[PDB]
Nucleic acid binder design. Structure first.
Ligand SMILES: [Mg+2]
Ligand SMILES: [Mg+2]
Ligand SMILES: [Mg+2]
Ligand SMILES: [Mg+2]
Ligand SMILES: [Mg+2]
Ligand SMILES: [Mg+2]
Ligand SMILES: [Mg+2]
Ligand SMILES: [Mg+2]
Ligand SMILES: [Mg+2]
Ligand SMILES: [Mg+2]
Ligand SMILES: [Mg+2]
Ligand SMILES: [Mg+2]
Ligand SMILES: [Mg+2]
Ligand SMILES: [Mg+2]
Ligand SMILES: [Mg+2]
Ligand SMILES: [Mg+2]
Ligand SMILES: [Mg+2]
Ligand SMILES: [Mg+2]
Ligand SMILES: [Mg+2]
Ligand SMILES: [Mg+2]
Ligand SMILES: [Mg+2]
Ligand SMILES: [Mg+2]
Ligand SMILES: [Mg+2]
Ligand SMILES: [Mg+2]
Ligand SMILES: [Mg+2]
Ligand SMILES: [Mg+2]
Ligand SMILES: [Mg+2]
Ligand SMILES: [Mg+2]
Ligand SMILES: [Mg+2]
Ligand SMILES: [Mg+2]
Ligand SMILES: [Mg+2]
Ligand SMILES: [Mg+2]
Ligand SMILES: [Mg+2]
Ligand SMILES: [Mg+2]
Ligand SMILES: [Mg+2]
Ligand SMILES: [Mg+2]
Ligand SMILES: [Mg+2]
Ligand SMILES: [Mg+2]
Ligand SMILES: [Mg+2]
Ligand SMILES: [Mg+2]
Ligand SMILES: [Mg+2]
Ligand SMILES: [Mg+2]
Ligand SMILES: [Mg+2]
Ligand SMILES: [Mg+2]
Ligand SMILES: [Mg+2]
Ligand SMILES: [Mg+2]
Ligand SMILES: [Mg+2]
Ligand SMILES: [Mg+2]
Ligand SMILES: [Mg+2]
Ligand SMILES: [Mg+2]
Ligand SMILES: [Mg+2]
Ligand SMILES: [Mg+2]
Ligand SMILES: [Mg+2]
Ligand SMILES: [Mg+2]
Ligand SMILES: [Mg+2]
Ligand SMILES: [Mg+2]
Ligand SMILES: [Mg+2]
Ligand SMILES: [Mg+2]
Ligand SMILES: [Mg+2]
Ligand SMILES: [Mg+2]
Ligand SMILES: [Mg+2]
Ligand SMILES: [Mg+2]
Ligand SMILES: [Mg+2]
Ligand SMILES: [Mg+2]
Ligand SMILES: [Mg+2]
Ligand SMILES: [Mg+2]
Ligand SMILES: [Mg+2]
Ligand SMILES: [Mg+2]
Ligand SMILES: [Mg+2]
Ligand SMILES: [Mg+2]
Ligand SMILES: [Mg+2]
Ligand SMILES: [Mg+2]
Ligand SMILES: [Mg+2]
Ligand SMILES: [Mg+2]
Ligand SMILES: [Mg+2]
Ligand SMILES: [Mg+2]
Ligand SMILES: [Mg+2]
Ligand SMILES: [Mg+2]
Ligand SMILES: [Mg+2]
Ligand SMILES: [Mg+2]
Ligand SMILES: [Mg+2]
Ligand SMILES: [Mg+2]
Ligand SMILES: [Mg+2]
Ligand SMILES: [Mg+2]
Ligand SMILES: [Mg+2]
Ligand SMILES: [Mg+2]
Ligand SMILES: [Mg+2]
Ligand SMILES: [Mg+2]
Ligand SMILES: [Mg+2]
Ligand SMILES: [Mg+2]
Ligand SMILES: [Mg+2]
Ligand SMILES: [Mg+2]
Ligand SMILES: [Mg+2]
Ligand SMILES: [Mg+2]
Ligand SMILES: [Mg+2]
Ligand SMILES: [Mg+2]
Ligand SMILES: [Mg+2]
Length: 245
RNA sequence: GGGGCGCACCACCGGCCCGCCUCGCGACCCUCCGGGGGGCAGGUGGAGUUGGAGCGCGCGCGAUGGCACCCGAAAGAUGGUGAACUAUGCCUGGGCAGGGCGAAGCCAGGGGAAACUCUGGUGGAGGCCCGCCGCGGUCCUGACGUGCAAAUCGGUCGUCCGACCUGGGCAUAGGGGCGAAAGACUAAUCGAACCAUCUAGUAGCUGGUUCCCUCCGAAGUUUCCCUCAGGAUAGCUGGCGCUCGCCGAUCAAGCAGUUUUAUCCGGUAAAGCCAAUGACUAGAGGCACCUAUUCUCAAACUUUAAAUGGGUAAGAGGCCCGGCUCGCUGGCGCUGGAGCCGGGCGUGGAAUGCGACGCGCCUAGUGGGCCAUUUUUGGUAAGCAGAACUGGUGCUGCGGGAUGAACCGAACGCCGGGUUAAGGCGCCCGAUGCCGACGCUCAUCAGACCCCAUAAAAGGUG
RNA sequence: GACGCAAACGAACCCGGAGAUGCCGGCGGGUGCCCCGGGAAAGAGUUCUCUUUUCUUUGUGAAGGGCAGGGCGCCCUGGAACGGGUUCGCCCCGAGAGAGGGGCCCGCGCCCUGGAAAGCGCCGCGCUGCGGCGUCCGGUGAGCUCUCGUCGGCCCUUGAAAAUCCGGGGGAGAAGGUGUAAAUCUCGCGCCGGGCCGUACCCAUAUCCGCAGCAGGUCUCCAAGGUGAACAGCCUCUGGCGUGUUGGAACAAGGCAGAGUAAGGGAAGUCGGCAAGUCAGAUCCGUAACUUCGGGAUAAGGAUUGGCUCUAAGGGCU
RNA sequence: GCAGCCAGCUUAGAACUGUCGCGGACCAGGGGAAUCCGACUGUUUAAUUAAAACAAAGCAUCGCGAAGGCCCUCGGCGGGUGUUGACGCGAUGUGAUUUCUGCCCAGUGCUCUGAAUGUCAAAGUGAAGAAAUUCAACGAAGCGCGGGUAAACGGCGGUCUUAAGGUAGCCAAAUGCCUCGUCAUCUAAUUAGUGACGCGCAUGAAUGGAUGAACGAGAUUCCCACUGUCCCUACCUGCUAUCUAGCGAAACCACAGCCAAGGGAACGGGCUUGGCAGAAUCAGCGGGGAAAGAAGACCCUGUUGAGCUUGACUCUAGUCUGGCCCUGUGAAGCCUCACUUACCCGGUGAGGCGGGUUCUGGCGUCAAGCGCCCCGCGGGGCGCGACCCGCCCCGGGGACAGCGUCAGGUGGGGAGUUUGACUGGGGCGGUACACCUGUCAAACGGUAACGCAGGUGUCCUAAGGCGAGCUCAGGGGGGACAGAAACCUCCCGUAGAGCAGAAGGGCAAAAGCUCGCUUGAUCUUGAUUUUCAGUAUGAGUACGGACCGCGAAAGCGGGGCCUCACGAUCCUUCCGGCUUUUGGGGUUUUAAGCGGGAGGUGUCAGAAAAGUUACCACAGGGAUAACUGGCUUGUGGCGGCCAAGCGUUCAUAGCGACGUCGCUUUUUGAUCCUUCGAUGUCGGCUCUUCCUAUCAUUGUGAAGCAGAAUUCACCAAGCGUUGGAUUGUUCACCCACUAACAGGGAACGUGAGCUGGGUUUAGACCGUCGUGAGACAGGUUAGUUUUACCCUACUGAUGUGAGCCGUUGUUGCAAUAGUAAUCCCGCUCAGUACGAGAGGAACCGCGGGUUCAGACAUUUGGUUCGUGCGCUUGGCUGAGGAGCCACUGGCGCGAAGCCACCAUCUGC
């Protein structure tokens, strides 16, 4: 047979992301002295739309403490923030929606967003629209804090991980049922070339292990092992269970 | 007319050498620690030996490895070149009459006790409608179909603000790409592009394989083979000889797809079942059976038993006699037996024919056969399928059967004369143009000769 | 006050602007074109009859100055309910309407410099270039384009970067000591320079690709009059052209096309209403089953349609 | 409060008016009632499939928190997703909405455990041994075991029964073979359509079920309207064809080109026997040249491929896991926890590490200030402001990730290869593939077929060897229980029993039975028979040499009474040998070798081996299938003979049982002779001729013929044999009509004649089947039908006896060839014959018609580019007038021509 569609996406020729009109990488201000021993005052300049994501981005303007300059940061817009408000980032920052402060300095049950997975990575978790992370518990002895991720998973992270207080703006985006295939065309035209998905049963055996036969049946158990080779790992990869549930 | 030395070669019997086996095991001069010998004999294995024949060169042919007689694949591999077509994506540009339905929003006026409703207008939303350009390509299965065109033309038709159309610049490259998925597209090439090379790839498979004359002349069968379109092998074929015989007296041997004589072998035809095994019909007698009869049968039944056929023997390699040898055999060195040696006796002791189809070596082709009389299996039968003997044919023309592969006659250098075969002799068309013999036969579908080109049961006061 | 003055020092560094923002709809301003009236001038066409007629020509570059016109969430005064202003739609208003008076931007429109000297039109003379006259005055529009605006609509779509240029913040610095100096973004003026490469032509029913002068393919710009809803079809002007690799003569069969026509019947043809026939535009009426209430729908089914002569209504301006 | 002036363009109404004509040209939806499928728009096989296929929104599941999921790369812990972060990315299924989505976790697969008993690599560990080595313990992942999971693949039965037994629904469906199901409806008639019925060959619930507005160049049925689709064709125009001037190919070609029969490679053009036969040509035409185009694409074969799939064979990338390696340090009880410096990751312009500014959508830029010091009031430096020290920039991991290297598992993701043969084509079946008996087999031997009837891959320490004794099968007479069969006994008993087995042979003091002694079923050499090449192996025979058994002995026995019961090389294994080598010697292990067994190749002289291809390819094959033709005629069809019987009686008016003889090639087979470098394949349409086994008509005979009607038979193919519904249909069935609605042939006539409905490429759907790719001889939908100008034949059209007193013309003759008419009705006969009636003819005569033939245009109708006349739309020449343009602008009428059973005439 030939190389299946799923394998051709790793070479990245026509499957690369469409990043022409994107405004930049949304990430927290990198950890410095002002965020380890205090807070820095930042003004929200504009809340812009990032092509490819349903979550708006805030252009928060900060002031460089070592040189006379104004640092422009592209944060994940927390739902509720607005242009003209002051966003405070640091250890001594107050618990307000939009502020950035470590998880160790926030009480249990605090709803946060743009949460750092490791101290300094400038935000990795809870970045999509309407999502958030809850601070479950703390541990001052080990300086570790337990948080709840939007997938229901509970991860033990460091207490120095910075996060934005609040929920990511643009919530409820998946609640509007797309009606036209054209709206799905434009939805993925800004993200990547992945929208029109031909079924493997609708192909020939040369390009998919589910194709072929005088009917469009799968023919083989759709649940495939995890150690299956690339080109065979299609269907339900390492499915623990199936059915309506 | 007698004797003899006997070449080469062949048959047989020995001797010896090496391997192996069995038997015999012993005292002894080579033991000098260790050890080497000890007629050993009787068998058997060996590509040995018993008075070398090879080596080199050349020539011819055969079977091989090689491009291997020539041309031919579908492929496989290595390296490379293409996204000017097209597929998708990216970037930056360009483009899409006039109408139709007419949503939210808004205005005003009616109805109502209120909740609120009703009407008109406005408004201009939509993968909305008609439709031009554009982009597509439904039907006519129209035109065309060596065309205008290696996909075009006409009318008709789909869509025509959207998942729209489109340029340029970019990206993805061959087991890779790309694919709203047709195995589609990737430069007229796609169920794996193109180019060059490996490569003159291999082919048990088609095709072709070049001058003459002369001579000889097949096989389609055996066994084996992942064989059954091929090979190996035997047979059939040719060539090369050679050993002789005739020369030197059918001298005689020897031989034979043939008889004769003698001697065996067989279980088929026929026959038989009142004989066995099995099948089967009918009465009859006796105290369903039992006895004597009876009808009808066998390929896997048979007492009996041919024709044709198979083997063997028809002499000097015989016959007769004597002596000798033996470890085998044993009442009996003659009891067997066999071997060795010598002597005696042609009236070569059936017919016919023939030089020995003698002894070798090398060897091509073939290993699809087909047909006829007879025999014979399966089948309703077949110009069917499968066997047996022989001939034919393939390979073969000629006379005849009009015609023809195979029937009939007869096989062939180039001719003249003669005469025939099979078949014919009204005319075509050589030959009855006989005063041919006797009879049969009338058909309003007559009849007219192997194979052979169809005719039956049953009928006629012809 | 918005902001204006020919200029009107100023670095490092910082901030911001322009470059630099999609598609669609409505409306408005301006050109171009088209159209109407001059009983307008200059030639021309017709003049059998009629036609104060028909046709053609009646213009001004860049840049600069001035002024219409358009735009402005720009300013000042002031204060709104009996709310008012206002658009086709909307929208706007004590975060300040209306009104009054200003300011700014765009002005591709008009006038002027250019610049009538040139260009067109007409007439005249000369020859084998010189002169004359004219180049005028208006009307409009559901008109068509282009463009500048404005207000919206749409997106689970938000519709580029950079070179370059500019403003501000900054006040580090520079300048002279009584008339000048430093400094000058003064289209105030003068002086000098701007190299290299492409540039013809075809651009398609004969200059490209398809082997060709191939009915194929190949990205754009400009675009008139009449009919009409139309960038439809049909006709005409400007421009182009000889009918698309040949002529002549016949008009048989059989073809291809004209989607030619055909009495009576009307799908009996045929696998099958294949084929083309019917219907068709517009106006006025009338529109079911079913439904996701959106539709179905131009459902279906009707009537009307010419020409001519009138009536009525729908405007603007002083 | 308007008067004056200016400015258009629409709308409504009315009169009048022409031939009731007017969106006059042009432009420009036929409609309705239903079924199926897909929701829709969109997309798709460039060059045969625009679709019901793909996509789609929606729905659902799966994976994954980044040291990650998915994927790329030869490789860098490089790259894509990712300028991403679960409202995300990645992998699948289903396919809008509505309505539901049942049961099954046994199987397969996925996944989760590890109170995990097994299986279990490398390394490490222990023991034995001179050591190589052997043995043992230990023993990861995975497997096994256990649980979960079906919107995972899939499945969802006849008291039996499993894993669940098809639930809601739906249906003779795009799914039902039987089948053209049954009923209803739709029509005169319906294999169609629709609605029902459902044990449904073989429906069914996200392999989604049911429904469904809107939509569709989708499939189907009906109705209205409409029409040349047809009845039934005709006329006109343009461009051609045609002729001409100029110009000027190609395909194709053994030679060629009249037929009938014959035979032949079984369908000649040439050959045979006949018919016969006259230059040179034109326009047509499509019968033939088994016409051309193309080394059949179907089929088979080849030890030729390729695409693709799996539970094929053998590997492999990746991945999982273990050991070693970078890999060090500290502590505690191999394991755990710590250490940082290896290594790894993250952040940053490496900007503050360790120890001692929240009151606003301002502003913040190289230090003010102070202290100290140096230049000649201008100038400069330094320090504090801005604390000191420090060894690693700051975080997060950490000797774990990860790299390297072996080891185990997984691995159709990928690679390579295979997937027997025989065979009345192949496949399926079977084994005729290695053997044995009888027969075939034709009296030596041998002798074939997918001939016949059978057997074999064993069995036996005796069922081998030997000796002795005994006699069997069966029948009869008898004899307590005891009988048709228990046991005793007598007589008869050629074997008719038994001998392991198939059958044949052989066997009576044996070869059978019984008994007691045994291991000749042992060890060896060669010869030899059978199969045979006269090779091997297997299976036999006769000996010789050993050592034995049994018997008193002669003797018998080296397996089975005989004919069957079996296996090369290589390798492994075992046994045997004072006997070899282990090589520079010696010793000892090991290894090798020699001799003999065993381990096995059943395709049995012995490869290690699953499919599919309708996406297919190549070399070939008429050695071999699917057509026609040929042979044959079982079968099908048709006709006889005999005469039991039927016919009230009466065999034979008409029939014909049991039997039997034929014919025919319009059935189907059998065969495989022709054709695979191709003979175009079903049906219909069209058109011609032929056969008679005669439906009708003509002339007859017969009757269980009164008439009428009908039946049987004869001469006889002259003439006719229809229009429709359904189905692609030949074949059926029905509706009507009719004198009758007879059956056939001609390559199962006829595709360069047509039409493609069907079959029979590639698209796609359903059901069943298969794990799958795929299959269906099941259904369904869409799917390029190319070329003639050559030679004949035929159709017409020119011309033709090259020699002559012939040339030329008129009127004619005529061989030969073609040939043509046909059937019906009405009146009359006549309500008559006939008959009891009911009913009910015929000849002559008369008047018409059907089908056909040949004409013809007076009439009617059609056509009209005489572009003849009128009218008229848009435009154009200024207008009138007169005209033109729109490939014939349109409309009405229309001459002449041509033309219609749509008008007319004639047919012996
Ligand atoms: Mg895509
Ligand atoms: Mg999806
Ligand atoms: Mg899909
Ligand atoms: Mg497909
Ligand atoms: Mg499949
Ligand atoms: Mg599906
Ligand atoms: Mg499916
Ligand atoms: Mg001698
Ligand atoms: Mg290969
Ligand atoms: Mg593209
Ligand atoms: Mg169009
Ligand atoms: Mg077309
Ligand atoms: Mg269609
Ligand atoms: Mg059609
Ligand atoms: Mg066509
Ligand atoms: Mg043609
Ligand atoms: Mg482009
Ligand atoms: Mg390739
Ligand atoms: Mg396919
Ligand atoms: Mg060669
Ligand atoms: Mg051959
Ligand atoms: Mg030979
Ligand atoms: Mg041979
Ligand atoms: Mg035969
Ligand atoms: Mg011969
Ligand atoms: Mg001969
Ligand atoms: Mg003859
Ligand atoms: Mg003769
Ligand atoms: Mg008779
Ligand atoms: Mg300043
Ligand atoms: Mg606008
Ligand atoms: Mg400044
Ligand atoms: Mg130029
Ligand atoms: Mg062209
Ligand atoms: Mg116009
Ligand atoms: Mg235009
Ligand atoms: Mg127009
Ligand atoms: Mg011309
Ligand atoms: Mg031309
Ligand atoms: Mg017509
Ligand atoms: Mg008509
Ligand atoms: Mg019909
Ligand atoms: Mg019909
Ligand atoms: Mg049609
Ligand atoms: Mg309707
Ligand atoms: Mg669709
Ligand atoms: Mg649906
Ligand atoms: Mg569509
Ligand atoms: Mg196509
Ligand atoms: Mg379509
Ligand atoms: Mg589908
Ligand atoms: Mg749904
Ligand atoms: Mg599923
Ligand atoms: Mg399970
Ligand atoms: Mg299945
Ligand atoms: Mg049920
Ligand atoms: Mg019908
Ligand atoms: Mg039904
Ligand atoms: Mg099912
Ligand atoms: Mg289910
Ligand atoms: Mg199903
Ligand atoms: Mg469609
Ligand atoms: Mg011929
Ligand atoms: Mg040919
Ligand atoms: Mg071939
Ligand atoms: Mg073979
Ligand atoms: Mg292969
Ligand atoms: Mg392939
Ligand atoms: Mg494979
Ligand atoms: Mg075979
Ligand atoms: Mg014999
Ligand atoms: Mg034996
Ligand atoms: Mg060893
Ligand atoms: Mg074999
Ligand atoms: Mg043959
Ligand atoms: Mg019969
Ligand atoms: Mg009787
Ligand atoms: Mg009978
Ligand atoms: Mg042909
Ligand atoms: Mg041929
Ligand atoms: Mg032919
Ligand atoms: Mg007859
Ligand atoms: Mg009779
Ligand atoms: Mg026939
Ligand atoms: Mg035929
Ligand atoms: Mg034909
Ligand atoms: Mg054809
Ligand atoms: Mg046909
Ligand atoms: Mg078809
Ligand atoms: Mg198909
Ligand atoms: Mg079809
Ligand atoms: Mg189609
Ligand atoms: Mg007339
Ligand atoms: Mg007019
Ligand atoms: Mg006029
Ligand atoms: Mg016209
Ligand atoms: Mg007329």
């Amino acid at each position: 047979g030939r190389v299946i569609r799923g394998q051709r996406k790793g070479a990245g020729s026509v499957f690369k992301a469409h990043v022409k009109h994107r405004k930049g990488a949304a990430k927290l201000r990198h950890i410095d002295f002002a965020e380890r021993h205090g807070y820095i005052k930042g003004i929200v300049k504009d809340i812009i739309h990032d092509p490819g994501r349903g979550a708006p981005l805030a252009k928060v303007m900060f002031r460089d403490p070592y040189r006379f300059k104004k640092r422009t940061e592209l944060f994940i817009a927390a739902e509720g923030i607005h242009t003209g408000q002051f966003i405070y980032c640091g250890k001594k920052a107050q618990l307000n929606i939009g502020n950035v402060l470590p998880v160790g300095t926030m009480p249990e049950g605090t709803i946060v967003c743009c949460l750092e997975e490791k101290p300094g990575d400038r935000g990795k978790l809870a970045r999509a629209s309407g999502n958030y992370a809850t601070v479950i518990s703390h541990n001052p002895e080990t300086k570790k804090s337990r948080v709840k991720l939007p997938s229901g998973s509970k991860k033990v992270i460091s207490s120095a991980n910075r996060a934005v207080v609040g929920v990511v703006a643009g919530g409820g985006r998946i609640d509007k049922p797309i009606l036209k295939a054209g709206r799905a065309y434009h939805k993925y035209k800004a993200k990547r070339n992945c929208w029109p998905r031909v079924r493997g049963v609708a192909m020939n055996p040369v390009e998919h292990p589910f194709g072929g036969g005088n009917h469009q049946h799968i023919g083989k158990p759709s649940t495939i092992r995890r150690d299956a080779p690339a080109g065979r790992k299609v269907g339900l990869i390492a499915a623990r269970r199936t059915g309506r549930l």
